[PDB]
Design a protein around this nucleic acid. Structure first.
Ligand SMILES: [Mg+2]
Ligand SMILES: [Mg+2]
Ligand SMILES: [Mg+2]
Ligand SMILES: [Mg+2]
Ligand SMILES: [Mg+2]
Ligand SMILES: [Mg+2]
Ligand SMILES: [Mg+2]
Ligand SMILES: [Mg+2]
Ligand SMILES: [Mg+2]
Ligand SMILES: [Mg+2]
Ligand SMILES: [Mg+2]
Ligand SMILES: [Mg+2]
Ligand SMILES: [Mg+2]
Ligand SMILES: [Mg+2]
Ligand SMILES: [Mg+2]
Ligand SMILES: [Mg+2]
Ligand SMILES: [Mg+2]
Ligand SMILES: [Mg+2]
Ligand SMILES: [Mg+2]
Ligand SMILES: [Mg+2]
Ligand SMILES: [Mg+2]
Ligand SMILES: [Mg+2]
Ligand SMILES: [Mg+2]
Ligand SMILES: [Mg+2]
Ligand SMILES: [Mg+2]
Ligand SMILES: [Mg+2]
Lengths: 123, 203, 123
RNA sequence: UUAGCUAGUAGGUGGGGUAACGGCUCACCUAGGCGACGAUCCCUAGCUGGUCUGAGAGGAUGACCAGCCACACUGGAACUGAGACACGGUCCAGACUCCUACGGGAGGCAGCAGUGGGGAAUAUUGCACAAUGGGCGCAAGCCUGAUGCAGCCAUGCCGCG
RNA sequence: UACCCGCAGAAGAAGCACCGGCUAACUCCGUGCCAGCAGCCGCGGUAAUACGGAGGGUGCAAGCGUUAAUCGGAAUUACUG
RNA sequence: AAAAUGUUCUACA
């Protein structure tokens, strides 16, 4: 607080760590689904959340969320992950990008399509 | 063939569901000419509820039945044990295991040699230890805990018997471990089949 | 003139620096391997990132000996040390892609023509 | 949670050396020099004008454009020269690629395009020296992937439909 | 080439996100703690403005969302403070 | 004097 104290040892800034470290400050990373499975959300939610254990090009082995209804992902599927935590699944800090490199778009979806990789339906 | 009806980690309603799905599978096997026999049967808090069940089937039609039932069984019923619980999707697991083993034949083969840790002239020279080997097993013992060949050979017979008995025991114990681990790998989601109501009314 | 326990240098770039002959192949009670002879080796020393690893058991062809080789005119060619080329157990083709130091004409045979071609100099 | 570091080290004399001062170097002498006002060591990093943000103070940052530095396959070295220890010079060594008659040779896109690879991701193997600038030349002119342009991309800003 | 002039004809040219609170914009249907959503608070277990579709609406618009990243909000390292 | 534990989510601007 004293000016002398600050001169001797200045205000040390709080270092902030990333909550998406496996992206290594990249908007997305390509990875391979080492396995595709379902898990249970923590309290108070209830579902099978669909997740993929994915090995990225940068070596990280992370768990990613597979959003939307239904997916075609299997093992050895090459997907993009974009980051963004799924709150009620602990330890799931990345989302799979729907419509990227192996992951299909969500079938028969009509609104918020760009969020799920769905082409504009034609009439 | 050797299905395992389990309520995974689900509550007394999942146990009741295991008891009702077991009955439903009984009825389907009977109408489809398959016989069902309970082998291991663990119950929940209530006697009519089934914590788990082990089932033996029979025939080629048994495979079709096991394929129609293996997976997650979902029961849509409001709890009869908790009045206004809210959860109504008790999930089961049905999974075949095939805990089968063959009784490898008594084809022991004996080779009698000197003993290790001799202690004496007549011992240094006599051949009294008996090394027994079970053919088509891989079990080789060496008994030398007696003064004479013949006692060692008899102990070697008993010890081959006992080592096959263990081989049986670790085999059955690994099946035990697999069967409980089934109780933790039951995804309480995508149901192979869904039954509703208090009377399992559909399939 | 190589026997069991003999340490050879490695005339290729497979990664090994030192190997030990653990078997002279091709005959019961066979004592020595000269140049051109296939020996069984265990790798005692290897570079950190090479095709072969320390403790690997594989084959090798002796290419230089300190005992030397005799020629039909009675001449002898000796080398300052013993050296071998690592070979695959089954194919008996060299593992490395580069042959270091000179080799000799006794390798001129369809089994090791690849070694002969890759060698910088053939005495 | 690196506290001690330093022997050409610090200084002096003299000789040598440099375009020039100088431990720059050498010989000898002295025993110093740096360090809590952080030396040494470790990790990270081109620096700046600036850029973004912020009311500001600050925080973050250094892509483009411009100044400076450094590097030119890796490690060294000098030569030539006003200027280099020199991207498209030399010599040596090394790794890699290639040629070979096996003796021995060749090469270096971090120039512009382009290819493969890596990657979430970043473009054409374009036109022209007409302009500006540069080298050489008395000049004409030649050369100039600088540059001017054009191609591709909503990548951004702005305008319009 | 810019630019100008003439010709034809509305022709050739609108999407993206959102609509429980924060935060501008609400209803119906489907679904029934499932499927799913989610930045946080939280939604969903039959009357869901929160899921998915539709109608409507809101915000932006040749862009719109998401992700990453920095600062801000954070007086949350405070010299200002 | 001695007296341990307790099931579950719970609705209502
Ligand atoms: Mg929407
Ligand atoms: Mg005794
Ligand atoms: Mg005797
Ligand atoms: Mg001087
Ligand atoms: Mg650097
Ligand atoms: Mg402020
Ligand atoms: Mg390079
Ligand atoms: Mg060099
Ligand atoms: Mg000169
Ligand atoms: Mg330089
Ligand atoms: Mg070049
Ligand atoms: Mg290039
Ligand atoms: Mg490429
Ligand atoms: Mg690639
Ligand atoms: Mg192209
Ligand atoms: Mg010109
Ligand atoms: Mg030219
Ligand atoms: Mg544009
Ligand atoms: Mg509102
Ligand atoms: Mg939504
Ligand atoms: Mg309800
Ligand atoms: Mg409804
Ligand atoms: Mg909403
Ligand atoms: Mg911030
Ligand atoms: Mg601040
Ligand atoms: Mg207790």
């Amino acid at each position: 607080a004293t000016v002398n104290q600050l001169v001797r040892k200045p205000r040390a800034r709080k270092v902030a760590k990333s909550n998406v470290p496996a992206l290594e400050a990249c908007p997305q990373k390509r990875g391979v689904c080492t396995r595709v499975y379902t898990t249970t959300p923590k309290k108070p939610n209830s579902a099978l959340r669909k997740v993929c254990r994915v090995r990225l090009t940068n070596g990280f082995e992370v768990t990613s969320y597979i959003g939307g209804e239904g997916h075609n992902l299997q093992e050895h599927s090459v997907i993009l992950i974009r980051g963004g935590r799924v709150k009620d699944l602990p330890g799931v800090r990345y989302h799979t990008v729907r419509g990227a490199l192996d992951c299909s778009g969500v079938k028969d979806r009509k609104q918020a399509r760009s969020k799920y990789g769905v082409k504009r339906p034609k009439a | 063939i050797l299905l395992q009806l389990s309520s995974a980690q689900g509550p007394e309603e999942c146990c009741l569901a295991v008891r009702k799905a077991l009955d439903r599978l009984i009825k389907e096997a009977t109408r489809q000419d398959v016989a069902v026999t309970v082998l291991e049967t663990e119950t929940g808090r209530y006697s009519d509820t089934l914590r788990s069940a082990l089932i033996s089937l029979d025939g080629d039609n048994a495979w079709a039945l096991s394929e129609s039932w293996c997976g997650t069984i979902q029961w849509i019923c409001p709890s009869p044990y908790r009045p206004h619980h809210g959860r109504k999707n008790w999930f089961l697991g049905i999974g075949r295991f095939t805990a089968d083993e063959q009784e490898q034949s008594d084809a022991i083969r004996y080779e009698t040699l000197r003993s290790s840790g001799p202690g004496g002239q007549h011992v240094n020279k006599t051949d009294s230890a008996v090394r027994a080997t079970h053919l088509a097993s891989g079990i080789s013992v060496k008994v030398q805990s007696e003064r004479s060949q013949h006692a060692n050979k008899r102990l070697a017979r008993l010890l081959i018997a006992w080592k096959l008995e263990q081989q049986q025991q670790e085999n059955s114990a690994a099946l035990k471990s697999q069967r409980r681990m089934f109780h933790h790998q039951i995804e309480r989601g995508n149901p192979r089949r869904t039954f509703t109501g208090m009377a399992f009314i559909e399939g | 003139m190589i026997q069991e326990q003999t340490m050879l240098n490695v005339a290729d770039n497979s990664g090994a620096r030192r190997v030990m002959c653990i078997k002279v192949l091709g005959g019961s009670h066979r004592r020595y391997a000269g140049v051109g002879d296939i020996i069984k080796i265990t790798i005692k020393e290897a570079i950190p990132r090479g095709k072969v690893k320390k403790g690997d058991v594989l084959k090798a062809v002796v290419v230089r000996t300190k005992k030397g080789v005799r020629r039909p005119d009675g001449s002898v060619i000796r080398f300052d040390g013993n050296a071998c080329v690592l070979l695959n157990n089954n194919s008996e083709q060299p593992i490395g892609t580069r042959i270091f130091g000179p080799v000799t004409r006794e390798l001129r045979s369809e089994k090791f023509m690849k070694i002969i071609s890759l060698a910088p100099e053939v005495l």
